[PDB]
Design a protein around this motif. Structure first.
Motif, PDB file in Angstrom:
ATOM      1  N   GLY A  25       0.788  -1.073  -0.036  1.00 26.16           N
ATOM      2  CA  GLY A  25       0.094  -0.077  -0.075  1.00 26.16           C
ATOM      3  C   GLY A  25       0.830   1.012   0.023  1.00 26.16           C
ATOM      4  N   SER A  26       0.173   2.462   0.058  1.00 23.30           N
ATOM      5  CA  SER A  26       0.855   3.702   0.003  1.00 23.30           C
ATOM      6  C   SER A  26       1.919   3.754   1.299  1.00 23.30           C
ATOM      7  N   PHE A  27       3.140   3.968   1.346  1.00 22.23           N
ATOM      8  CA  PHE A  27       4.112   4.025   2.559  1.00 22.23           C
ATOM      9  C   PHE A  27       4.355   3.177   3.337  1.00 22.23           C
ATOM     10  N   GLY A  28       3.535   1.720   3.056  1.00 21.22           N
ATOM     11  CA  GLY A  28       3.983   0.613   3.569  1.00 21.22           C
ATOM     12  C   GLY A  28       3.331  -0.616   3.152  1.00 21.22           C
ATOM     13  N   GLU A  29       3.808  -1.874   3.629  1.00 23.00           N
ATOM     14  CA  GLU A  29       3.564  -3.237   3.121  1.00 23.00           C
ATOM     15  C   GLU A  29       2.412  -3.620   3.936  1.00 23.00           C
ATOM     16  N   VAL A  30       1.434  -4.536   3.321  1.00 18.31           N
ATOM     17  CA  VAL A  30       0.136  -4.813   4.053  1.00 18.31           C
ATOM     18  C   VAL A  30       0.516  -6.435   4.261  1.00 18.31           C
ATOM     19  N   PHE A  31       0.000  -6.830   5.681  1.00 17.83           N
ATOM     20  CA  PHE A  31       0.123  -8.188   5.870  1.00 17.83           C
ATOM     21  C   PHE A  31      -1.358  -8.789   6.584  1.00 17.83           C
ATOM     22  N   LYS A  32      -1.489 -10.163   6.191  1.00 10.05           N
ATOM     23  CA  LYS A  32      -2.652 -10.598   6.869  1.00 10.05           C
ATOM     24  C   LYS A  32      -2.643 -10.634   8.239  1.00 10.05           C
ATOM     25  N   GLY A  33      -3.797 -10.593   9.027  1.00 11.35           N
ATOM     26  CA  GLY A  33      -3.975 -10.690  10.429  1.00 11.35           C
ATOM     27  C   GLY A  33      -5.180 -11.148  11.156  1.00 11.35           C
ATOM     28  N   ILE A  34      -5.150 -11.512  12.289  1.00 11.04           N
ATOM     29  CA  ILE A  34      -6.458 -11.880  13.075  1.00 11.04           C
ATOM     30  C   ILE A  34      -6.576 -10.937  14.278  1.00 11.04           C
ATOM     31  N   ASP A  35      -7.864 -10.437  14.497  1.00  8.74           N
ATOM     32  CA  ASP A  35      -8.205  -9.971  15.671  1.00  8.74           C
ATOM     33  C   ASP A  35      -8.439 -11.146  16.793  1.00  8.74           C
ATOM     34  N   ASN A  36      -7.825 -10.973  17.738  1.00 11.73           N
ATOM     35  CA  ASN A  36      -7.686 -12.059  18.915  1.00 11.73           C
ATOM     36  C   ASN A  36      -9.072 -12.066  19.531  1.00 11.73           C
ATOM     37  N   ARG A  37      -9.899 -10.957  19.565  1.00 10.16           N
ATOM     38  CA  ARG A  37     -11.128 -10.843  20.251  1.00 10.16           C
ATOM     39  C   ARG A  37     -12.125 -11.562  19.755  1.00 10.16           C
ATOM     40  N   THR A  38     -12.337 -11.154  18.246  1.00  9.48           N
ATOM     41  CA  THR A  38     -13.370 -11.827  17.316  1.00  9.48           C
ATOM     42  C   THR A  38     -13.165 -12.917  16.593  1.00  9.48           C
ATOM     43  N   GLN A  39     -11.751 -13.285  16.282  1.00 10.71           N
ATOM     44  CA  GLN A  39     -11.236 -14.321  15.471  1.00 10.71           C
ATOM     45  C   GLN A  39     -11.377 -13.603  14.003  1.00 10.71           C
ATOM     46  N   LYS A  40     -11.997 -12.529  13.702  1.00  7.33           N
ATOM     47  CA  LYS A  40     -12.050 -12.035  12.294  1.00  7.33           C
ATOM     48  C   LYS A  40     -10.684 -11.616  11.730  1.00  7.33           C
ATOM     49  N   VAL A  41     -10.507 -11.944  10.232  1.00  9.53           N
ATOM     50  CA  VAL A  41      -9.109 -11.548   9.743  1.00  9.53           C
ATOM     51  C   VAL A  41      -9.286 -10.211   9.355  1.00  9.53           C
ATOM     52  N   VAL A  42      -8.054  -9.475   9.666  1.00  8.07           N
ATOM     53  CA  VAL A  42      -7.703  -8.143   9.253  1.00  8.07           C
ATOM     54  C   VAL A  42      -6.630  -7.911   8.130  1.00  8.07           C
ATOM     55  N   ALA A  43      -6.337  -6.824   7.862  1.00 12.57           N
ATOM     56  CA  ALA A  43      -5.216  -6.455   6.923  1.00 12.57           C
ATOM     57  C   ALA A  43      -4.387  -5.529   7.804  1.00 12.57           C
ATOM     58  N   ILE A  44      -3.161  -5.920   8.000  1.00  9.78           N
ATOM     59  CA  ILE A  44      -2.256  -4.913   8.902  1.00  9.78           C
ATOM     60  C   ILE A  44      -1.265  -4.140   8.145  1.00  9.78           C
ATOM     61  N   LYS A  45      -1.186  -3.030   7.834  1.00  9.92           N
ATOM     62  CA  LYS A  45      -0.186  -2.252   7.007  1.00  9.92           C
ATOM     63  C   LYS A  45       0.737  -1.739   7.942  1.00  9.92           C
ATOM     64  N   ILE A  46       2.168  -2.110   7.883  1.00 14.87           N
ATOM     65  CA  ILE A  46       3.164  -1.704   8.390  1.00 14.87           C
ATOM     66  C   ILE A  46       4.100  -0.652   7.861  1.00 14.87           C
ATOM     67  N   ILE A  47       4.308   0.491   8.435  1.00 17.79           N
ATOM     68  CA  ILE A  47       5.238   1.374   7.998  1.00 17.79           C
ATOM     69  C   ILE A  47       6.249   1.763   8.916  1.00 17.79           C
ATOM     70  N   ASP A  48       7.516   1.556   8.324  1.00 18.19           N
ATOM     71  CA  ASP A  48       8.541   1.583   9.177  1.00 18.19           C
ATOM     72  C   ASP A  48       9.007   3.099   9.205  1.00 18.19           C
ATOM     73  N   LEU A  49       8.788   3.591  10.326  1.00 21.97           N
ATOM     74  CA  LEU A  49       8.946   5.199  10.701  1.00 21.97           C
ATOM     75  C   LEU A  49      10.364   5.732  10.580  1.00 21.97           C
ATOM     76  N   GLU A  50      11.567   4.652  10.714  1.00 19.81           N
ATOM     77  CA  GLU A  50      12.837   5.038  10.570  1.00 19.81           C
ATOM     78  C   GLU A  50      13.359   5.375   9.078  1.00 19.81           C
ATOM     79  N   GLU A  51      12.795   4.274   8.257  1.00 18.63           N
ATOM     80  CA  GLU A  51      13.141   4.492   6.610  1.00 18.63           C
ATOM     81  C   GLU A  51      12.062   5.747   6.036  1.00 18.63           C
ATOM     82  N   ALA A  52      11.052   6.212   6.979  1.00 14.63           N
ATOM     83  CA  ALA A  52      10.149   7.435   6.268  1.00 14.63           C
ATOM     84  C   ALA A  52      10.791   8.547   6.486  1.00 14.63           C
TER      85      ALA A  52
END
Ligand SMILES: Cc1nc([C@H]2CN(c3ncnc4[nH]cc(-c5cccc(C#N)c5)c34)CCO2)no1
Length: 291
Positions: A25-52
């Protein structure tokens, strides 16, 4: 001081499980993830603030835009978390692929094009009524759920209109889809997304936008100079007219997203989004057989 970081949360691995990379995605990579409260799947975009470095200002804006949006036609944002040098942006997961991926196996029919366009138009109508401009409307930024629901994604270059700022002038977007006034860096507004939507309609019909075989620097002069593109080929007269309405060099002559929802092309051809599962299955079958 940071106004848009008022709701910044902490310790994301306490509520979410991070899984594999699913793209960028813009400025970062997108990862699959799980919400541990509901067990629903989420998309987790990680933006490394050091490289930005210069994108930091836009990253603050992307969190703000996503947090201020609440629509079924825009990817939901569930919160931003700070974890050391990494910022996690938790987003709605959409497992059907992008509209661009769904074009890979072959052409779409006019019912599919109208259905996708109508949902994009509802998203645009939502955004434009909230004084936001997406500025990167293209098939790659149109995502589908596994059940055929269609949503706008990637708010990295999104613009915000205010009472003091009635227009934007920033050179942002993807060259092939950019409005002439955007390339010229003239004062523009939501009408720039209507031009981008017209190019997206050509892309959904033909598989690629106009000038797709040219280096993007060449389109930077061709777009303001040339007559606007038209949809060429054996397509219905309302689809050609829908494209023509969007692709007007004069932004005030382009209709709004609200007006386009009533266009003969959308009214005659758009069907239920559930029918789009056929395109998602076509893509899965295609992807599995590719060498
Ligand atoms: C190739 C290929 N590329 C991809 C896409 C998949 N995509 C997503 N997949 C699933 N759920 C999602 N929810 C939100 C997104 C999403 C998409 C685009 C920009 C942004 C941002 N910023 C967020 C998303 C992430 C990008 O890569 N899948 O295969």
């Amino acid at each position: 001081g940071l106004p848009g970081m008022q709701n910044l949360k902490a310790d994301p691995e306490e509520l979410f499980t991070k899984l594999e990379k699913i793209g960028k995605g813009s400025f970062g990579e997108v990862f699959k993830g799980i919400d541990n409260r509901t067990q629903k799947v989420v998309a987790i975009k990680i933006i490394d603030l050091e490289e930005a470095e210069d994108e930091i200002e836009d990253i603050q804006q992307e969190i703000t835009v996503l947090s201020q949006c609440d629509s079924p036609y825009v990817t939901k944002y569930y919160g931003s978390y700070l974890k050391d040098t990494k910022l996690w942006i938790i987003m709605e997961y959409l497992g059907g692929g992008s509209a661009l991926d769904l074009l890979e196996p072959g052409p779409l029919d006019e019912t599919q094009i109208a259905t996708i366009l109508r949902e994009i138009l509802k998203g645009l109508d939502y955004l434009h009524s909230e004084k936001k401009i997406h500025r990167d409307i293209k098939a790659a930024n149109v995502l589908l759920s596994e059940h055929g629901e269609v949503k706008l994604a990637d708010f990295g270059v999104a613009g915000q209109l205010t009472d003091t700022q009635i227009k934007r002038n920033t050179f942002v977007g993807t060259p092939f889809w950019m409005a002439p006034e955007v390339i010229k860096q003239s004062a523009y507004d939501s009408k720039a997304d209507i031009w981008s939507l017209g190019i997206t309609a050509i892309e959904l019909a033909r598989g690629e936008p106009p000038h797709s075989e040219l280096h993007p620097m060449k389109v930077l002069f061709l777009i303001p100079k040339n007559n606007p593109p038209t949809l060429e080929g054996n397509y219905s007269k309302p689809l050609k007219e829908f494209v023509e309405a969007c692709l007007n060099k004069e932004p005030s002559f382009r209709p709004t997203a609200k007006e386009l929802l009533k266009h003969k092309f959308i009214l005659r051809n758009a069907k239920k989004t559930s029918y789009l599962t056929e395109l998602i299955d076509r893509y899965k079958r295609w992807k599995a057989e590719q060498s």
